[PDB]
Design an enzyme around this catalytic site. Structure first.
Site, short mmCIF file in Angstrom:
data_model
loop_
_atom_site.label_atom_id
_atom_site.label_comp_id
_atom_site.label_asym_id
_atom_site.label_seq_id
_atom_site.Cartn_x
_atom_site.Cartn_y
_atom_site.Cartn_z
N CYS A 143 4.33 -5.93 2.16
CA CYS A 143 4.56 -5.53 0.78
C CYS A 143 5.51 -6.53 0.10
O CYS A 143 6.62 -6.77 0.56
CB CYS A 143 5.11 -4.10 0.70
N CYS A 163 2.67 -1.80 -0.84
CA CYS A 163 2.49 -0.67 0.08
C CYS A 163 1.91 0.56 -0.60
O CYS A 163 2.02 0.70 -1.80
CB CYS A 163 3.80 -0.34 0.81
N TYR A 167 4.33 10.88 0.46
CA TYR A 167 4.23 12.29 0.03
C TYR A 167 5.52 13.05 0.36
O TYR A 167 6.29 13.42 -0.52
CB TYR A 167 3.02 12.99 0.67
N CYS A 243 -6.83 -9.15 21.20
CA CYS A 243 -7.61 -10.22 21.84
C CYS A 243 -6.78 -11.03 22.81
O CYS A 243 -7.30 -11.50 23.84
CB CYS A 243 -8.22 -11.16 20.81
N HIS A 634 -8.01 -15.92 16.40
CA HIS A 634 -8.66 -15.08 17.39
C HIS A 634 -8.53 -15.74 18.76
O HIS A 634 -8.60 -16.98 18.86
CB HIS A 634 -10.13 -14.90 17.03
ZN ZN Z 1 6.37 -1.54 -0.38
#
Ligand code: ZN
Lengths: 673, 75
Positions: A143, A163, A167, A243, A634
């Site tokens: 963020c 972000c 709640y 991986c 990867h």
């Molecule tokens: Zn944030």
């Protein structure tokens, strides 16, 4: 006249515990195997500890623990029943009739406790995307406002990464929605949901998950575009960025010593496991190895990943990680659990001879140390195609600025012969204190093998610092030989003819008055053996500029800790020393004894084991980091088995004919007979 | 005492250290000499990663040891 269900039930009632909010109930996977409610035979949940066991394994918990009563789960839509051992009596959830109420209430209370369309956005076609956008990477986002590393939305208007909503307590710090609030920019995509097939697109405006037919093009704005079987050929499910673990673990279990310790000996291991085997190193490692060398769509090593990552800053998270770091982490974890028992690390371990030479006097010192990985330098100046690479970099720069298709890739082609040379080459070291000269001078350092291991591990140091100190991957091509002769690199030790570098008041007031520093003045009276002011004056004049270490003058524990260490395979006396050296800190004390035992044994002898052999090798396996970035990539590995090369890409296991042995990162060389 | 740090150039440098110095201390001593930011340093000795909050004496790092700096290739 056989034992009734009721009789048996009443008799082990006390062993029926009812779970609580803060309780792990292992309901999804077996402790000893990869069995699941979905396996034929189901899963048996011990109703005392809440641990799970497949049909072949419950009997182990029974015998070890006494626990007779299990809740048996089978999914295929789930079918549940109570089973008592050893005779496997079954009682259904509604078979509790006629038993006293308080037992019916205990039994069902326990059981219940154990069992716990998008439309297109109105804005997809109307969407104004801002000019001069940022180049959003394939991983590792944060963020832009707080610190959060999961739950991040990319706003399709301006490339902002912020972000999600809070709640309940879970979620983000609301940065993304407040950004929508301030701007009106309606659409965002959930970073990490971006597959070839779509993503999670959210509309702030419609307060909904929405479709965006033009996603490819909106993401493209930010520079984002969307066979073997049998024993020893198992795939590993991706757990989200696992991986690196997959690649390491696949190589380990190709090596016979690791097979013998953890797979051939799994019965002994399972037998010696504590009540909760999900938490047991040897068990988990054994379980992994078995699942790779028998018959078993692949395996999902959640249980192993969870255990070997416990408490670790990197390997407890789900983000992308370096293969060498994981390797050394697992190696040191094996080391901790194999003190005074079979140690498979011995297959890797070797002795480095470090040599210093004071260049001015020609005097020498040989030091010695253990290691597991040889670090191979990559000397860019040795590149065989400097100009062919400069035309490439020009064409790519041009193709970016124009936003066109990039040119076909070219890598600096570095000879292996050069890397090996650079390893071996004597190396100049400045600002070196020569005890012979008693002056700062210049040393010549060299590195050799005091021992060659059964499997040699090589890390290609294909990285360096760029400008503003950003790490650069060196995307380089180095043909690693199928055949390695590293014998010219054996250390030879100290030699005849070679001379060794040496090692180790009323006067003081009179000298400090004169202008000499107190520290030098103290050392002056001491090193002349109190012979009066004159001799001490002479000393500070010779030696005041010396480094401190050239003329040094030195001027209750807990019982739960002790036993933890002794259980790792040490004495009581050894445990006490460790804690008393490490200000009574457990973790540090453990680091202490492991790094100190070899010395403590030489005081026991006053009244490290390595396997040697020729330094003559054949390429066995290599782990490859794919991409141009340090930060994303990867991992896959190639392993030579039954005479033929095999690629292991997570779930996918295939015969490869043309192994890219020049793009690898960590290499594994097996010693010849 | 003196120790050695091999840097990612190839260049080996010396550092003045005490056994009781933390790793972050050694990291800081590296910035002092080489300019490399401590948040970018990852140190390896004798096949073991060195962690912050531990001293050189916890790892039994003695005079004239060689520590190695490495970088991550995340994947
Ligand atoms: Zn944030």
């Amino acid at each position: 006249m056989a034992e009734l269900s009721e009789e048996a039930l009443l008799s082990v009632l006390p062993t029926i515990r009812v779970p609580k909010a803060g309780d792990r109930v292992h309901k999804d996977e077996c402790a000893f195997s990869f069995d699941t409610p979905e396996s034929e035979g189901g899963l048996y949940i011990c109703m005392n500890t809440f641990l799970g066991f497949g049909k072949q394994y419950v009997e182990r918990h029974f015998n070890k623990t006494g626990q007779r009563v299990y809740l048996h789960l089978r999914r295929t839509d789930e079918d549940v029943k109570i089973v008592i051992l050893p005779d496997y009596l079954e009682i259904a959830r509604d078979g509790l009739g006629g038993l006293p109420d308080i037992v019916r209430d205990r039994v069902t209370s326990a059981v219940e406790a154990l069992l716990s369309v998008r439309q297109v956005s109105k804005h997809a076609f109307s969407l104004k995307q801002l000019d001069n956008p940022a180049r959003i990477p394939p991983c590792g986002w944060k963020c832009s406002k707080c610190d959060m590393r999961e739950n991040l939305w990319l706003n399709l208007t301006d490339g902002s990464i912020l972000c999600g909503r809070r709640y309940d307590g879970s979620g983000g710090n609301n940065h993304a929605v407040e950004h929508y609030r301030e701007t009106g920019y309606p659409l965002a995509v959930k970073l990490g949901t971006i597959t070839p097939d779509g993503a999670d697109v959210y509309s702030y405006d419609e307060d909904d998950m929405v479709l965006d037919p033009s996603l490819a093009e909106h993401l493209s704005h930010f520079g984002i575009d969307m066979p073997l079987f049998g024993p020893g050929y198992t795939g590993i499910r991706n757990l989200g960025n696992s991986c690196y673990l997959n690649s390491v673990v696949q190589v380990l279990f190709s090596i016979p010593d690791f097979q013998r310790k953890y797979v051939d000996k799994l019965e002994k291991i399972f037998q010696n496991a504590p009540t909760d085997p999900t938490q047991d190193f040897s068990t988990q490692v054994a379980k992994l190895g078995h699942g790779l060398l028998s018959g078993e769509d692949g395996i999902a090593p959640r249980m192993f990943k969870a255990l070997i990552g416990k408490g670790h800053p990197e390997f407890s998270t789900n983000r992308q990680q370096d293969a060498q770091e994981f390797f050394l982490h697992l190696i040191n974890m094996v080391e901790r659990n194999c003190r005074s028992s079979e140690n498979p690390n011995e297959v890797f371990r070797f002795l480095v001879e470090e040599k210093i030479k004071c260049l001015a006097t020609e005097k020498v010192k040989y030091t010695q140390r253990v290691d597991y990985i040889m670090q191979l330098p990559v000397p860019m100046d040795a590149a065989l195609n400097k100009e062919e690479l400069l035309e490439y970099e020009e064409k790519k720069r041009q193709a970016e600025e124009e936003k066109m298709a990039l040119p076909e890739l070219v890598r600096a082609q570095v000879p292996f012969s050069s890397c090996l040379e650079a390893y071996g080459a004597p190396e100049q070291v400045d600002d070196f204190w020569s005890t012979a000269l008693q002056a700062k001078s210049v040393a010549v350092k060299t590195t050799r093998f005091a021992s060659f291991p059964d499997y040699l591990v090589i890390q290609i140091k294909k990285f360096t610092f760029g400008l503003d100190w950003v790490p650069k991957k060196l995307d380089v091509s180095i043909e690693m030989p199928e055949e390695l002769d590293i014998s010219q690199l054996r250390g030879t030790g100290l030699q005849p003819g070679e001379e060794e570098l040496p090692d180790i008041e009323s006067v003081i007031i009179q000298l400090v008055e004169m202008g000499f520093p107190m520290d030098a003045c103290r050392k002056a009276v001491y090193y002349t053996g109190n012979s009066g002011a004159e001799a001490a004056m002479n000393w500070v004049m010779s030696h005041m500029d010396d480094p401190d270490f050239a003329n040094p003058l030195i001027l209750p524990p807990p019982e739960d800790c002790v036993t933890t260490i002794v259980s790792m395979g040490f004495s009581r006396d050894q445990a006490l020393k460790a804690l008393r050296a490490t200000n009574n800190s457990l973790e540090r004390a453990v680091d202490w004894i492991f790094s100190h035992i070899d010395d403590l044994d030489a005081e026991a002898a006053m009244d490290p084991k390595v396997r040697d052999g020729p330094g003559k090798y054949q390429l066995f396996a290599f782990i490859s980091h794919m991409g141009t970035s340090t930060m994303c990539g990867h991992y896959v590995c190639h392993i030579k088995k039954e005479g033929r090369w095999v690629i292991y890409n997570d779930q996918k296991v295939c015969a490869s004919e043309k192994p890219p042995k020049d793009l690898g990162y960590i290499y594994f060389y097996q010693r010849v007979a | 005492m003196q120790i050695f740090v091999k840097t990612l150039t190839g260049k080996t440098i010396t550092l003045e250290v005490e056994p009781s110095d933390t790793i972050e201390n050694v990291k800081a001593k590296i910035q002092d000499k080489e300019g490399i930011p401590p948040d970018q340093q990852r140190l390896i000795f004798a096949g073991k990663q060195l962690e912050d909050g531990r001293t050189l004496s916890d790892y039994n790092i003695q005079k004239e040891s060689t520590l190695h700096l490495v970088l991550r290739l995340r994947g």
